[PDB]
GROMACS .gro file of C-alpha atoms in nm:
model
  428
    1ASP     CA    1  -0.083  -0.324   3.777
    2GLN     CA    2  -0.023  -0.075   3.498
    3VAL     CA    3  -0.038  -0.332   3.217
    4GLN     CA    4  -0.355  -0.379   3.011
    5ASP     CA    5  -0.217  -0.632   2.767
    6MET     CA    6   0.110  -0.768   2.628
    7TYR     CA    7   0.175  -0.939   2.292
    8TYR     CA    8   0.444  -0.994   2.031
    9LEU     CA    9   0.560  -0.746   1.766
   10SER     CA   10   0.481  -0.768   1.397
   11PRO     CA   11   0.783  -0.861   1.181
   12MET     CA   12   0.812  -0.496   1.073
   13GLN     CA   13   0.784  -0.367   1.427
   14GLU     CA   14   1.053  -0.612   1.534
   15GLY     CA   15   1.289  -0.496   1.255
   16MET     CA   16   1.216  -0.138   1.348
   17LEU     CA   17   1.296  -0.192   1.716
   18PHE     CA   18   1.623  -0.369   1.635
   19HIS     CA   19   1.743  -0.092   1.402
   20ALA     CA   20   1.628   0.188   1.635
   21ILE     CA   21   1.818   0.052   1.928
   22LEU     CA   22   2.133  -0.003   1.725
   23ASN     CA   23   2.131   0.344   1.556
   24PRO     CA   24   2.024   0.602   1.816
   25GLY     CA   25   2.043   0.969   1.739
   26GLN     CA   26   1.990   0.929   1.365
   27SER     CA   27   1.618   1.022   1.326
   28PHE     CA   28   1.513   0.674   1.214
   29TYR     CA   29   1.140   0.618   1.201
   30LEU     CA   30   1.070   0.968   1.326
   31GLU     CA   31   0.804   1.192   1.176
   32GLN     CA   32   0.799   1.561   1.277
   33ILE     CA   33   0.483   1.757   1.192
   34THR     CA   34   0.487   2.138   1.224
   35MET     CA   35   0.151   2.317   1.237
   36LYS     CA   36   0.148   2.696   1.224
   37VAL     CA   37  -0.165   2.824   1.397
   38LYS     CA   38  -0.317   3.168   1.338
   39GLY     CA   39  -0.613   3.221   1.568
   40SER     CA   40  -0.739   3.130   1.913
   41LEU     CA   41  -0.617   2.794   2.053
   42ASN     CA   42  -0.729   2.660   2.392
   43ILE     CA   43  -0.415   2.470   2.491
   44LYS     CA   44  -0.555   2.330   2.816
   45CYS     CA   45  -0.850   2.189   2.623
   46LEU     CA   46  -0.624   2.064   2.343
   47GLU     CA   47  -0.434   1.875   2.614
   48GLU     CA   48  -0.757   1.726   2.747
   49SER     CA   49  -0.842   1.604   2.400
   50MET     CA   50  -0.500   1.451   2.341
   51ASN     CA   51  -0.561   1.240   2.654
   52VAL     CA   52  -0.900   1.127   2.526
   53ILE     CA   53  -0.709   1.016   2.217
   54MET     CA   54  -0.450   0.846   2.443
   55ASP     CA   55  -0.724   0.623   2.583
   56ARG     CA   56  -0.897   0.577   2.247
   57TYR     CA   57  -0.588   0.440   2.069
   58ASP     CA   58  -0.393   0.164   2.243
   59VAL     CA   59  -0.082   0.217   2.032
   60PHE     CA   60  -0.011   0.548   2.212
   61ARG     CA   61  -0.009   0.367   2.545
   62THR     CA   62   0.235   0.099   2.418
   63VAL     CA   63   0.600   0.051   2.522
   64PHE     CA   64   0.847  -0.216   2.411
   65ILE     CA   65   1.063  -0.466   2.604
   66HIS     CA   66   1.373  -0.628   2.453
   67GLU     CA   67   1.606  -0.682   2.752
   68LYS     CA   68   1.606  -1.001   2.963
   69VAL     CA   69   1.333  -1.151   2.742
   70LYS     CA   70   1.336  -1.430   2.486
   71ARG     CA   71   1.148  -1.242   2.213
   72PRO     CA   72   1.055  -0.869   2.227
   73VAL     CA   73   0.705  -0.784   2.342
   74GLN     CA   74   0.489  -0.469   2.328
   75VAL     CA   75   0.299  -0.376   2.644
   76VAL     CA   76  -0.018  -0.167   2.641
   77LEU     CA   77  -0.044   0.042   2.960
   78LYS     CA   78  -0.392   0.098   3.098
   79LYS     CA   79  -0.342   0.475   3.128
   80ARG     CA   80  -0.067   0.718   3.031
   81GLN     CA   81  -0.088   1.089   3.103
   82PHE     CA   82   0.013   1.299   2.798
   83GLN     CA   83   0.142   1.654   2.844
   84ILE     CA   84   0.204   1.923   2.584
   85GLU     CA   85   0.530   2.112   2.631
   86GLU     CA   86   0.407   2.469   2.618
   87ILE     CA   87   0.676   2.732   2.554
   88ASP     CA   88   0.623   3.105   2.567
   89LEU     CA   89   0.840   3.287   2.314
   90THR     CA   90   0.647   3.614   2.338
   91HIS     CA   91   0.942   3.796   2.509
   92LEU     CA   92   1.166   3.723   2.207
   93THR     CA   93   1.212   3.893   1.871
   94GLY     CA   94   1.094   3.711   1.558
   95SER     CA   95   1.439   3.581   1.461
   96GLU     CA   96   1.495   3.463   1.821
   97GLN     CA   97   1.164   3.274   1.799
   98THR     CA   98   1.263   3.096   1.478
   99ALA     CA   99   1.607   3.006   1.608
  100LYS     CA  100   1.442   2.878   1.927
  101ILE     CA  101   1.201   2.659   1.730
  102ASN     CA  102   1.465   2.526   1.489
  103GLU     CA  103   1.689   2.448   1.789
  104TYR     CA  104   1.399   2.248   1.933
  105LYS     CA  105   1.333   2.063   1.607
  106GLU     CA  106   1.697   1.967   1.551
  107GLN     CA  107   1.755   1.844   1.905
  108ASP     CA  108   1.418   1.663   1.883
  109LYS     CA  109   1.532   1.468   1.578
  110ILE     CA  110   1.852   1.352   1.757
  111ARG     CA  111   1.665   1.281   2.081
  112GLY     CA  112   1.418   1.044   1.925
  113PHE     CA  113   1.236   0.826   2.175
  114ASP     CA  114   1.328   0.567   2.432
  115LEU     CA  115   1.082   0.304   2.317
  116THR     CA  116   1.108   0.117   2.648
  117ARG     CA  117   0.970   0.414   2.852
  118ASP     CA  118   0.844   0.711   2.654
  119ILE     CA  119   0.508   0.769   2.501
  120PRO     CA  120   0.622   0.731   2.136
  121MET     CA  121   0.470   1.070   2.061
  122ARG     CA  122   0.519   1.423   2.188
  123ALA     CA  123   0.410   1.777   2.124
  124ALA     CA  124   0.553   2.118   2.188
  125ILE     CA  125   0.351   2.432   2.120
  126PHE     CA  126   0.537   2.763   2.097
  127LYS     CA  127   0.341   3.082   2.173
  128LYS     CA  128   0.492   3.361   1.958
  129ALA     CA  129   0.220   3.623   2.005
  130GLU     CA  130  -0.138   3.648   2.127
  131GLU     CA  131  -0.302   3.452   1.838
  132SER     CA  132  -0.003   3.280   1.682
  133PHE     CA  133   0.135   2.942   1.779
  134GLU     CA  134   0.376   2.689   1.630
  135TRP     CA  135   0.284   2.330   1.716
  136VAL     CA  136   0.549   2.059   1.659
  137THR     CA  137   0.435   1.698   1.696
  138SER     CA  138   0.688   1.410   1.682
  139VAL     CA  139   0.591   1.043   1.653
  140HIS     CA  140   0.771   0.712   1.616
  141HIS     CA  141   0.646   0.496   1.336
  142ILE     CA  142   0.671   0.172   1.536
  143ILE     CA  143   0.332   0.264   1.683
  144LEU     CA  144   0.169   0.470   1.402
  145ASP     CA  145   0.259   0.494   1.037
  146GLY     CA  146   0.246   0.817   0.837
  147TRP     CA  147  -0.084   0.730   0.666
  148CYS     CA  148  -0.266   0.698   1.000
  149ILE     CA  149  -0.189   1.040   1.146
  150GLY     CA  150  -0.484   1.202   0.966
  151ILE     CA  151  -0.735   0.967   1.134
  152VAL     CA  152  -0.595   1.063   1.474
  153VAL     CA  153  -0.590   1.433   1.397
  154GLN     CA  154  -0.951   1.427   1.280
  155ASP     CA  155  -1.060   1.255   1.604
  156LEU     CA  156  -0.845   1.496   1.807
  157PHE     CA  157  -1.017   1.806   1.665
  158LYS     CA  158  -1.364   1.650   1.694
  159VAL     CA  159  -1.296   1.596   2.067
  160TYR     CA  160  -1.137   1.942   2.089
  161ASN     CA  161  -1.417   2.143   1.928
  162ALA     CA  162  -1.677   1.959   2.137
  163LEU     CA  163  -1.488   2.009   2.462
  164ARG     CA  164  -1.425   2.382   2.409
  165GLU     CA  165  -1.787   2.451   2.307
  166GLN     CA  166  -1.901   2.224   2.597
  167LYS     CA  167  -2.090   1.999   2.355
  168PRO     CA  168  -2.111   1.617   2.374
  169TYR     CA  169  -1.941   1.405   2.114
  170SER     CA  170  -1.940   1.045   2.001
  171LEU     CA  171  -1.679   0.869   1.801
  172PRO     CA  172  -1.699   0.553   1.592
  173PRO     CA  173  -1.565   0.228   1.742
  174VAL     CA  174  -1.212   0.126   1.646
  175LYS     CA  175  -1.055  -0.219   1.651
  176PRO     CA  176  -0.743  -0.264   1.867
  177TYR     CA  177  -0.404  -0.314   1.698
  178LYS     CA  178  -0.375  -0.655   1.867
  179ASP     CA  179  -0.642  -0.773   1.622
  180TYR     CA  180  -0.382  -0.719   1.344
  181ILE     CA  181  -0.121  -0.907   1.548
  182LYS     CA  182  -0.370  -1.192   1.587
  183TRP     CA  183  -0.427  -1.195   1.208
  184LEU     CA  184  -0.052  -1.207   1.157
  185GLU     CA  185  -0.012  -1.509   1.386
  186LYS     CA  186  -0.242  -1.710   1.153
  187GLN     CA  187  -0.039  -1.634   0.840
  188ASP     CA  188   0.210  -1.887   0.706
  189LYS     CA  189   0.535  -1.689   0.726
  190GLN     CA  190   0.723  -1.935   0.509
  191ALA     CA  191   0.457  -1.922   0.237
  192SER     CA  192   0.481  -1.542   0.233
  193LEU     CA  193   0.861  -1.552   0.198
  194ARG     CA  194   0.815  -1.809  -0.076
  195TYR     CA  195   0.575  -1.572  -0.247
  196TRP     CA  196   0.842  -1.298  -0.268
  197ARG     CA  197   1.117  -1.541  -0.365
  198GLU     CA  198   0.914  -1.677  -0.658
  199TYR     CA  199   0.799  -1.330  -0.760
  200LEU     CA  200   1.163  -1.227  -0.776
  201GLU     CA  201   1.296  -1.553  -0.925
  202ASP     CA  202   1.574  -1.474  -1.170
  203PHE     CA  203   1.566  -1.098  -1.115
  204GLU     CA  204   1.923  -0.982  -1.147
  205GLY     CA  205   1.975  -0.635  -1.010
  206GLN     CA  206   1.982  -0.278  -1.131
  207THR     CA  207   2.143   0.054  -1.043
  208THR     CA  208   1.879   0.296  -1.160
  209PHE     CA  209   2.000   0.598  -1.367
  210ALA     CA  210   2.356   0.471  -1.325
  211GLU     CA  211   2.514   0.704  -1.581
  212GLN     CA  212   2.353   1.001  -1.403
  213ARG     CA  213   2.467   0.909  -1.048
  214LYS     CA  214   2.744   1.135  -0.923
  215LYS     CA  215   3.016   0.909  -0.783
  216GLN     CA  216   3.103   1.113  -0.478
  217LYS     CA  217   3.165   1.025  -0.118
  218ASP     CA  218   2.855   0.925   0.079
  219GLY     CA  219   2.619   1.182   0.234
  220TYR     CA  220   2.260   1.304   0.186
  221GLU     CA  221   2.177   1.653   0.055
  222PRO     CA  222   1.796   1.654   0.045
  223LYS     CA  223   1.626   1.845  -0.239
  224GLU     CA  224   1.280   1.852  -0.393
  225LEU     CA  225   1.112   1.944  -0.726
  226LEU     CA  226   0.738   1.994  -0.699
  227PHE     CA  227   0.501   2.016  -0.993
  228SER     CA  228   0.146   1.927  -1.097
  229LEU     CA  229  -0.029   1.740  -1.375
  230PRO     CA  230  -0.267   1.991  -1.543
  231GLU     CA  231  -0.634   1.933  -1.464
  232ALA     CA  232  -0.731   1.800  -1.808
  233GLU     CA  233  -0.449   1.544  -1.805
  234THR     CA  234  -0.532   1.459  -1.441
  235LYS     CA  235  -0.894   1.398  -1.536
  236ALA     CA  236  -0.811   1.175  -1.836
  237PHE     CA  237  -0.548   0.988  -1.629
  238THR     CA  238  -0.806   0.921  -1.359
  239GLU     CA  239  -1.070   0.817  -1.614
  240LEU     CA  240  -0.828   0.570  -1.769
  241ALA     CA  241  -0.746   0.409  -1.434
  242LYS     CA  242  -1.117   0.370  -1.355
  243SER     CA  243  -1.196   0.232  -1.699
  244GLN     CA  244  -0.914  -0.024  -1.651
  245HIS     CA  245  -1.029  -0.118  -1.299
  246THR     CA  246  -0.717   0.010  -1.130
  247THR     CA  247  -0.592   0.296  -0.922
  248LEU     CA  248  -0.414   0.622  -0.983
  249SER     CA  249  -0.119   0.480  -0.785
  250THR     CA  250  -0.094   0.177  -1.014
  251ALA     CA  251  -0.125   0.395  -1.323
  252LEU     CA  252   0.157   0.618  -1.207
  253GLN     CA  253   0.375   0.311  -1.132
  254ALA     CA  254   0.302   0.189  -1.485
  255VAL     CA  255   0.413   0.520  -1.640
  256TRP     CA  256   0.728   0.523  -1.429
  257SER     CA  257   0.806   0.165  -1.546
  258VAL     CA  258   0.813   0.283  -1.912
  259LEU     CA  259   1.056   0.568  -1.823
  260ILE     CA  260   1.291   0.338  -1.627
  261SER     CA  261   1.279   0.072  -1.906
  262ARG     CA  262   1.436   0.336  -2.135
  263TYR     CA  263   1.718   0.438  -1.899
  264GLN     CA  264   1.794   0.083  -1.806
  265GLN     CA  265   1.761  -0.051  -2.162
  266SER     CA  266   1.582  -0.347  -2.018
  267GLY     CA  267   1.241  -0.511  -1.990
  268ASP     CA  268   1.287  -0.652  -1.639
  269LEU     CA  269   1.300  -0.387  -1.367
  270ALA     CA  270   1.214  -0.309  -1.010
  271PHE     CA  271   1.135  -0.021  -0.774
  272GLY     CA  272   0.984   0.008  -0.427
  273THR     CA  273   0.620   0.093  -0.373
  274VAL     CA  274   0.454   0.187  -0.046
  275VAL     CA  275   0.153  -0.042   0.007
  276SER     CA  276  -0.130  -0.006   0.253
  277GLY     CA  277  -0.067  -0.333   0.439
  278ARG     CA  278  -0.430  -0.360   0.549
  279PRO     CA  279  -0.575  -0.710   0.521
  280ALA     CA  280  -0.928  -0.721   0.382
  281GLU     CA  281  -1.013  -1.029   0.590
  282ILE     CA  282  -0.994  -0.802   0.898
  283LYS     CA  283  -1.342  -0.655   0.927
  284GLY     CA  284  -1.307  -0.283   0.996
  285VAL     CA  285  -0.935  -0.272   0.915
  286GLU     CA  286  -0.964   0.068   0.747
  287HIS     CA  287  -1.031   0.236   1.084
  288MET     CA  288  -0.747   0.072   1.272
  289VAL     CA  289  -0.452   0.286   1.380
  290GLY     CA  290  -0.097   0.155   1.401
  291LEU     CA  291   0.190   0.037   1.180
  292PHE     CA  292   0.055  -0.111   0.855
  293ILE     CA  293   0.224   0.040   0.552
  294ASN     CA  294   0.538  -0.112   0.406
  295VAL     CA  295   0.785  -0.066   0.120
  296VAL     CA  296   0.777  -0.373  -0.101
  297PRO     CA  297   0.944  -0.449  -0.436
  298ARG     CA  298   0.750  -0.406  -0.756
  299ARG     CA  299   0.895  -0.604  -1.046
  300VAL     CA  300   0.769  -0.509  -1.393
  301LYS     CA  301   0.821  -0.711  -1.711
  302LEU     CA  302   0.794  -0.523  -2.041
  303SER     CA  303   0.770  -0.758  -2.338
  304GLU     CA  304   0.782  -0.661  -2.702
  305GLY     CA  305   0.471  -0.474  -2.804
  306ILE     CA  306   0.338  -0.439  -2.448
  307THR     CA  307   0.083  -0.158  -2.426
  308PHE     CA  308   0.002   0.074  -2.139
  309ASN     CA  309  -0.332  -0.102  -2.076
  310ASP     CA  310  -0.140  -0.431  -2.065
  311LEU     CA  311   0.088  -0.280  -1.805
  312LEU     CA  312  -0.203  -0.150  -1.596
  313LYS     CA  313  -0.349  -0.502  -1.596
  314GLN     CA  314  -0.019  -0.672  -1.508
  315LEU     CA  315   0.042  -0.441  -1.210
  316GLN     CA  316  -0.321  -0.442  -1.086
  317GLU     CA  317  -0.323  -0.822  -1.071
  318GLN     CA  318   0.011  -0.849  -0.891
  319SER     CA  319  -0.098  -0.586  -0.633
  320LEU     CA  320  -0.399  -0.804  -0.547
  321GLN     CA  321  -0.187  -1.121  -0.539
  322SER     CA  322   0.062  -0.953  -0.307
  323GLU     CA  323  -0.191  -0.840  -0.050
  324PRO     CA  324  -0.170  -1.130   0.203
  325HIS     CA  325   0.214  -1.097   0.207
  326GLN     CA  326   0.262  -0.719   0.249
  327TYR     CA  327   0.367  -0.768   0.611
  328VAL     CA  328   0.711  -0.913   0.523
  329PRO     CA  329   0.999  -0.666   0.590
  330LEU     CA  330   1.201  -0.560   0.288
  331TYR     CA  331   1.514  -0.675   0.465
  332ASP     CA  332   1.386  -1.032   0.472
  333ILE     CA  333   1.290  -1.017   0.106
  334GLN     CA  334   1.630  -0.878   0.012
  335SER     CA  335   1.794  -1.161   0.203
  336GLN     CA  336   1.591  -1.413  -0.001
  337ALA     CA  337   1.744  -1.251  -0.312
  338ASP     CA  338   2.101  -1.217  -0.178
  339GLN     CA  339   2.064  -0.860  -0.307
  340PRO     CA  340   2.082  -0.579  -0.050
  341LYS     CA  341   2.021  -0.334  -0.336
  342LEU     CA  342   1.728  -0.510  -0.495
  343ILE     CA  343   1.561  -0.167  -0.516
  344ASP     CA  344   1.715   0.180  -0.491
  345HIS     CA  345   1.424   0.426  -0.535
  346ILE     CA  346   1.057   0.426  -0.445
  347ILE     CA  347   0.720   0.553  -0.557
  348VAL     CA  348   0.483   0.679  -0.282
  349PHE     CA  349   0.123   0.754  -0.365
  350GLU     CA  350  -0.041   0.922  -0.061
  351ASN     CA  351  -0.419   0.952  -0.089
  352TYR     CA  352  -0.467   1.193   0.204
  353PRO     CA  353  -0.153   1.395   0.275
  354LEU     CA  354  -0.162   1.578   0.610
  355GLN     CA  355  -0.025   1.875   0.416
  356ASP     CA  356  -0.365   1.926   0.251
  357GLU     CA  357  -1.303   2.544   1.155
  358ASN     CA  358  -1.148   2.461   1.489
  359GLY     CA  359  -1.163   2.825   1.596
  360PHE     CA  360  -0.829   2.889   1.431
  361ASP     CA  361  -0.655   2.889   1.094
  362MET     CA  362  -0.410   2.620   0.989
  363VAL     CA  363  -0.172   2.849   0.800
  364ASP     CA  364   0.065   2.568   0.711
  365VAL     CA  365   0.140   2.203   0.782
  366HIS     CA  366   0.485   2.062   0.696
  367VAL     CA  367   0.606   1.703   0.748
  368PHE     CA  368   0.967   1.592   0.796
  369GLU     CA  369   1.077   1.231   0.762
  370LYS     CA  370   1.437   1.106   0.713
  371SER     CA  371   1.512   0.998   0.355
  372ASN     CA  372   1.615   0.635   0.290
  373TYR     CA  373   1.649   0.646  -0.092
  374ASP     CA  374   1.838   0.875  -0.327
  375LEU     CA  375   1.522   0.931  -0.537
  376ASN     CA  376   1.159   0.918  -0.440
  377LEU     CA  377   0.860   0.980  -0.671
  378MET     CA  378   0.571   1.112  -0.452
  379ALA     CA  379   0.222   1.196  -0.567
  380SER     CA  380  -0.115   1.288  -0.416
  381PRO     CA  381  -0.460   1.339  -0.577
  382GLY     CA  382  -0.625   1.665  -0.663
  383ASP     CA  383  -0.783   1.852  -0.947
  384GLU     CA  384  -0.426   1.873  -1.073
  385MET     CA  385  -0.232   1.576  -0.943
  386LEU     CA  386   0.056   1.679  -0.719
  387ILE     CA  387   0.392   1.524  -0.798
  388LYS     CA  388   0.721   1.563  -0.613
  389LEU     CA  389   1.061   1.431  -0.696
  390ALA     CA  390   1.252   1.416  -0.363
  391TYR     CA  391   1.616   1.335  -0.416
  392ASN     CA  392   1.970   1.325  -0.283
  393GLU     CA  393   2.151   1.611  -0.458
  394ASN     CA  394   2.488   1.452  -0.366
  395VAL     CA  395   2.385   1.181  -0.618
  396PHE     CA  396   2.156   1.349  -0.875
  397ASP     CA  397   2.194   1.694  -1.029
  398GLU     CA  398   1.896   1.927  -1.027
  399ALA     CA  399   1.919   1.946  -1.408
  400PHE     CA  400   1.864   1.571  -1.433
  401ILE     CA  401   1.566   1.586  -1.200
  402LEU     CA  402   1.418   1.862  -1.419
  403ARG     CA  403   1.464   1.642  -1.728
  404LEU     CA  404   1.284   1.365  -1.537
  405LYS     CA  405   0.994   1.599  -1.469
  406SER     CA  406   0.951   1.687  -1.839
  407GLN     CA  407   0.984   1.318  -1.938
  408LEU     CA  408   0.723   1.207  -1.681
  409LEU     CA  409   0.478   1.475  -1.798
  410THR     CA  410   0.523   1.393  -2.165
  411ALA     CA  411   0.503   1.016  -2.093
  412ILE     CA  412   0.173   1.059  -1.899
  413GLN     CA  413   0.024   1.258  -2.181
  414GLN     CA  414   0.130   1.017  -2.452
  415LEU     CA  415   0.037   0.696  -2.268
  416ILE     CA  416  -0.317   0.825  -2.184
  417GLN     CA  417  -0.368   0.939  -2.545
  418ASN     CA  418  -0.251   0.600  -2.686
  419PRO     CA  419  -0.302   0.348  -2.405
  420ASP     CA  420  -0.340   0.062  -2.655
  421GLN     CA  421  -0.019   0.124  -2.850
  422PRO     CA  422   0.319  -0.033  -2.774
  423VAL     CA  423   0.476   0.171  -2.496
  424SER     CA  424   0.805   0.143  -2.693
  425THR     CA  425   0.651   0.408  -2.927
  426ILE     CA  426   0.639   0.686  -2.666
  427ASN     CA  427   0.894   0.963  -2.721
  428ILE     CA  428   1.085   1.063  -2.411
   0.00000   0.00000   0.00000
């Protein structure tokens, strides 16, 4: 028997499987990480390590069954042999190499995975010269969300550097993903839907930045504007969040709420927020690897005279309230609102972005994921906080995105200088 265990899918996994099967070739749920290596890499040993990781993390050994079954199940296989696709490009010119690697990345996006058979993760390493490699890893988020990859990479290099130097290693114990499925089977699914319904009671709908949306035919032209919050502002922003017993993520969502209240001319608004999805009742949940994070609606109410510190408190409390119900798929929430466009942009605060020795230099790490919203506000910590506006240029002009950058920066500065004044006083 190849099967170690078999159990049901989380609601989000089930939604993901259904949409993946029905929309093949479209890059859904696919993350592609490109690592450019400069230095010595022991590929054979890297492969050995990957297979240690295969046995360490049950999600990599999981496949899915949906045919001739009453309800889909995920099956953990006792052992699965991983193999790196190693490609030697050394006999090609530099332009040939790049074309070769882009060709691979483009066909890889279309290929996706057959979730009923494949390991939902693969790796190709391209050798371009003696000490230069390009290492493309693809993964399906039904087994591992984007905020988990770092954990796995860290363990992979720990195994790798021990194996190559012939040293012993030990790794901390990790709970299996089934433990999260078991936690989910104790939750009251109807109470969680009721939570979202009541939270969203009487919320009416909103096209964000409607007067700025280009009304063109459908299509996605992905663009990005990257910028940073200067260190002194970043410091004061962080101090304010700490002093108010909240997070940088919540503080940024609060500032964004003020900006959107002005464009929408309204005090009742919504946007999507990526939440961790990790239940505190699950001892050791921070070390688990699998699909946890979710996009949920954030609804913000701005009354007359509300201050920034008021807003920080309103959002911090609702985050905590929401925590037992973060497993509900957005689709099911939107159906409880008879509003398929309840939200149309999101805010993503990523504490530990993969994109910032082992005997080599990591020259660059780039992440690709397909875009599901026409505007995405993305931020990560640092001495100067890193902010990205990722948008669909077929909808928003670059000039408008640039105005949004200067408004966000001036709104941060003004709300941290006067966090106890009505946010209606801020000049944007």
